[PDB]
Amino acid sequence: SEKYFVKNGQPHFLISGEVHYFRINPKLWRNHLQLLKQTGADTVSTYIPWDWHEIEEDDFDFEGKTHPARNLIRFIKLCKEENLDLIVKPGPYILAEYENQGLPSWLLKKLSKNAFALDENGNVISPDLVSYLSDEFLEYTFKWYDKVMPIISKHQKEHYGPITMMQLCNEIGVFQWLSGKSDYNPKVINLYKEFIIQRYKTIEKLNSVYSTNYNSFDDLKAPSGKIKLRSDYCAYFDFHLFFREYYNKYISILKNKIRSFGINIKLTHNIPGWIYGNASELPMLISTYSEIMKNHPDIIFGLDHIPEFVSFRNAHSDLACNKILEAMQPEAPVWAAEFQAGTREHHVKAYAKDLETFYIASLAHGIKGFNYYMFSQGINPEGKGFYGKTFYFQTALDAASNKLALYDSIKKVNRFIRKEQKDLLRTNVNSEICVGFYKPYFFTELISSQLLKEKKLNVEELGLYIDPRFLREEILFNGLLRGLQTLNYNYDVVDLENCDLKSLTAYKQLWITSAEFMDAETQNLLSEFVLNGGNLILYPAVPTLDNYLNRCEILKNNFGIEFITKDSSHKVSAFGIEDVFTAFSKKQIYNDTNSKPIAFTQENEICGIRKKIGKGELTILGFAFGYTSDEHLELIDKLVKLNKIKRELFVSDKDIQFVVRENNKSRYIFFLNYHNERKTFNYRKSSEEISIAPFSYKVIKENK
Amino acid sequence: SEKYFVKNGQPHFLISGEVHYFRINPKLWRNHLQLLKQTGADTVSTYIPWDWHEIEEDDFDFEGKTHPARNLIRFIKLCKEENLDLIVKPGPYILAEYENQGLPSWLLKKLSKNAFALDENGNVISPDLVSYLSDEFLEYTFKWYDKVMPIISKHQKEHYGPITMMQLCNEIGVFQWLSGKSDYNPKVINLYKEFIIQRYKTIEKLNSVYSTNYNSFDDLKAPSGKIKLRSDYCAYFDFHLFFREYYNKYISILKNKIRSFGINIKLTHNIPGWIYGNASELPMLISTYSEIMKNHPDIIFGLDHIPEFVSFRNAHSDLACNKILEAMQPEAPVWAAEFQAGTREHHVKAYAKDLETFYIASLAHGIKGFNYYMFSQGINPEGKGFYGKTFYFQTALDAASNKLALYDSIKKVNRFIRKEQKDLLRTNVNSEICVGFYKPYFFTELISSQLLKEKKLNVEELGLYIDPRFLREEILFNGLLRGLQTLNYNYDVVDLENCDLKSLTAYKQLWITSAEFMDAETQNLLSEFVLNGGNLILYPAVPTLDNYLNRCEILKNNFGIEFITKDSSHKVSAFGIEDVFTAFSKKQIYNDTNSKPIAFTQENEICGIRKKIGKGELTILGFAFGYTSDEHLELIDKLVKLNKIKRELFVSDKDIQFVVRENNKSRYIFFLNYHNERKTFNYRKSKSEEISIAPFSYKVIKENK
């Protein structure tokens, strides 16, 4: 049932620590590794920076010939001697606050202009930003691979070396997220043209979907600038699809090259997106990897969790991310490839007592393995740091291997995980609620994000009122998912793309946060789900358009729904809850023939109905709410209770969060106090009186 | 030397609690007032909502004829019976999470289009957002004042009523700021044209400053859209100067109207700007009040502090805000008109143990009075809540008057205040460091802010590289001021506008965070400061332009500086500190003439010097740093120590914050732990005392003599 790492044919909790040999005095390599093993960690993880080892063109030092900290071979030997497995990350990009993001200075100086990512005017975006599919870039990457990959191949577990996994590059696409800028390198744009011809076949077909007036594919230009027309939206939508395919073409080239060295170990990639201690943008970054995840069952994506603190302000972020990755990557364990230990930023403190609670919360929230990033602080050699001499602060170990406050917290958590892993890894939560993940709402990193200064997507110019990023961040991520977690209702997430109806029948309710657009396949899926006996909760809009903003009213028609969109006060009443604040003046007002009205505008127009369709049940709310009042928690609670869903426990203090994880034999109850208040409470199934410190936890075991 | 409130010729710490009579069962008003008085509070504060009392047009209820909680008159009488003084706040705007921000529904339905704030297209920005000088808006406002002001006048302290203070309107500009758009209403555009004609006299003089080619003032239009030319920047700069006059005209009209009722009590206004628990934009909002604070010595501005939590992430916001209000309003005590109690937002928790530390930190940080907002929870009657039925959570009292967890925290703090106020209010911190506040850098709410929808200002298009909002947010507010507080160096802030040289000579160092532009008056002031014996630290730029981006090289010439601007690595070395990360590739490279070079680029070019000039000292760094690395604290520490400034205490844990306040009689040592760590440390005045402090907690030590 559960997915988990395995060691010696038994469940294994992967405990890795990140230790950058190239940033640590080599006299202290053994001490760092011993102190890491002594916490109960089983694995160590590092970058192998191209710039650090190809010191000049075709001059490689992996043995400390030119700098003792270039002795990669010795570091691998010490990992083996100190009984740690090793994760290696040879790039070619490593980021990691390393100058030029790990690319050699000599390479960036030598590359032709056409090897760089270019803006729409043919100017170099950044002196350290190559075009991923540049011939010259891949030729040099391949020569780096020809030197580092034989070493990695020799030192795999197979050959009783320590190497058990390898990351390909680092956060593919990250520079487009950070800048909001696409690569317009003509070679990229040629691949985009081929993608469009492949997709539409004829200019007439393209013109019919986009409402363009092209005489041929020769008329077609890559989109740029603000979206003013529905045709611009269409072109940008497909440009996002193209980048997902392009990142798959890149990682496939690296993967096939790596496999040519007989490297048969597990391959990895990593997903960023936390900002200022919350992760509502991370699902957008998950969505950039949609094509890789479809085409590579053998590449495990892990999460980069950067909470910064642990409170009710961010309690919901890690769980939502873990659940969305599980939806998109069901056949691999959910693990944190970069699991905050200390802080990248001196002024952004990472307290041991916060991170200890985050580590236990992560267990509650289904994490199956993690890599403490950074377990060991580093000192940048020889000028090579982008930001200062020091790499991370408040780590488990400083760069000199001094133990810091976090060390004892990691040892304590690791001791618990080792004691419990055989049973804990085989537990799941009993979710009766399923929440739909509609990937096209997330396809906006070039047009609408938390990092994009000037928004290119303004849906009011397109004749729309529900912005997909507002919906996915405030109505879904910070709204419904935060509210369910706060109310201690389990949910699962499901990827609606190519979704199997049979998997939806497990759940008592499916929740769909819908904008005005949804593709035919998803409208058909939801239609069949209800007609066959499913209970659907759908808000804030019945969709009437497809992904290209062309008419598509399958779900509306199948469900017998009629509506007019009308302006009214932001507040509605719903299920007898007065003064429910909603996001929009515009609301769907429903015809109530064969329906039960359950929500009303200030002038008593019907903005929500319940209906029986076939064997199933529909609840439609023509208004948007997230979680910004107690009325929103009341409404989510009432909606869940329509299908008689119960929490696992009665807990006397509603502001205690709990997670019950179970299998046939074992139950774990995780109690999490995300508040600056000592809380005393009691619990029972739906003597037993417990006190939890501020920003703390308690784990109870029950035998069944 | 300290400014503080006075009652009967003695220092008085103003302790107010906000209690909304209109959101509380009137049978429980007395119980709320008694429980507030029992915390040691002396004052209660409330809005008087126009929508609540003018129930239809020209139908007024202040006596509970139509709803018991419209009985304002009984609430005033109960304040008197329960020995609480009263602050009243009749609007016209109140915000207060009240439908339509407090304006009557009947009003917003009746007003014509011209009464609203409009975008550059002519469209209504928000259906509750009026244009302040709208003739129609002011006519209805005056009719509301005609009914509420006689009541306020009758119940003033001078007539043995409880009313001691009144707020005019609420956070002027806040509704516009939150909308993310500026007001292009036609009353506004016409007043702007009069403003420009009065400022420049002839189109030729305007053209000489802006480098424009207008044939007449009739050709000049209110600036709109993005700044592409230095002349666009000039137009928007005057547009900012115009809005500061516009807000002064609004408050002036309200004040003159109020005074006509024989209302002689203290008038107030309240300052917005906290966002998600920090206040880096608050200085922008306070700068919009520049002309009010110059023209109205009798209107006391107070701060609206909304920390939400109390940690290292926002520790510097309240002190920086308190210091900037003191700079703009040096003749009145620094007070919080709204001092967070509970939370306005159910999903944004406010923990008693956080706010108790915030209260003590506020005392350390020089606060002289406050109004706990909200002391009492409310329930909206009759659907009046903007966002739900309940008004505030985790307050001192719930709407029923039950004590909640915060009540005992507020009683504890108030007890310490009442025991100590006679001495505590008279205490000062010994500030050897003065930081300059250059208001023009803040004048960007039309073009560049955290809330503005459209970024109109891109300095690179103007041939500049130092953005005034980046400088004031990251180099000054989150950088220098955060760094000085973290290092436990006391600083004062001084407004450079019409600044007296004698008010700068008391300090060992003056720190100026400078862009490439600075007016001739300020360039001249700083020149005289150093020539006369001042010690000046100036970065990241010697300015070479004035506020209209025209040539002004006064300070460069007076300091005998030559420089070229050159691109290099972000990293520099400064005072032997290697790998100091700086914000820009571009840096100032100084000639070494008659100077000591103290900072170097990766190509070892000189990007900082120190020199002696007349009787004074100059330290110039041609690179920008805030506080985003440990090297930045090292660099600030090195700079402070150039003039042998010392901390007041040796403390064994550098992450403990302290403030020493003293007068002739008493010394108070405030220790603040903004970190989630139980800390045990020792200290001594610069045999050591040992202290253990809880996470997110505080200690106060009083010493006699």
Numbering used by the authors:
A (entry chain B): 6 to 691, 699 to 716
B (entry chain A): 6 to 691, 698 to 716
Paper text:
The IALB_1185 protein, which is encoded in the gene cluster for endo-β-1,2-glucanase homologs in the genome of Ignavibacterium album, is a glycoside hydrolase family (GH) 35 protein. Here, we showed using recombinant IALB_1185 that this protein has glycosyltransferase activity toward β-1,2-glucooligosaccharides, and that the kinetic parameters for β-1,2-glucooligosaccharides are not within the ranges for general GH enzymes. Kinetic analysis further revealed that the enzyme has wide aglycone specificity regardless of the anomer, and that the β-1,2-linked glucose dimer sophorose is an appropriate donor. We propose that IALB_1185 be redefined β-1,2-glucooligosaccharide:d-glucoside β-d-glucosyltransferase as a systematic name and β-1,2-glucosyltransferase as an accepted name.
First, we determined the ligand-free structure of wild-type IaSGT at 1.75 Å resolution after solving the initial phase by the SAD method. There are two molecules in an asymmetric unit with almost the same configuration (rsmd between subunits A and B, 0.5 Å), which is identical to the biological assembly suggested by the results of size-exclusion chromatography analysis and SDS-PAGE. In the ligand-free structure, the side chain of Arg349 is disordered beyond the Cδ atom. The side chain of Glu102 is also disordered (subunit A) or flips out from subsite −1 (subunit B). Subunit A of the ligand-free structure adopts a conformation in which both the Leu100 side chain and helix α6 are close to the substrate pocket (type 1), while subunit B adopts a conformation in which both are away from the substrate pocket (type 3). The overall conformational change on binding of ligands is small (rmsd, approximately 0.2 Å).
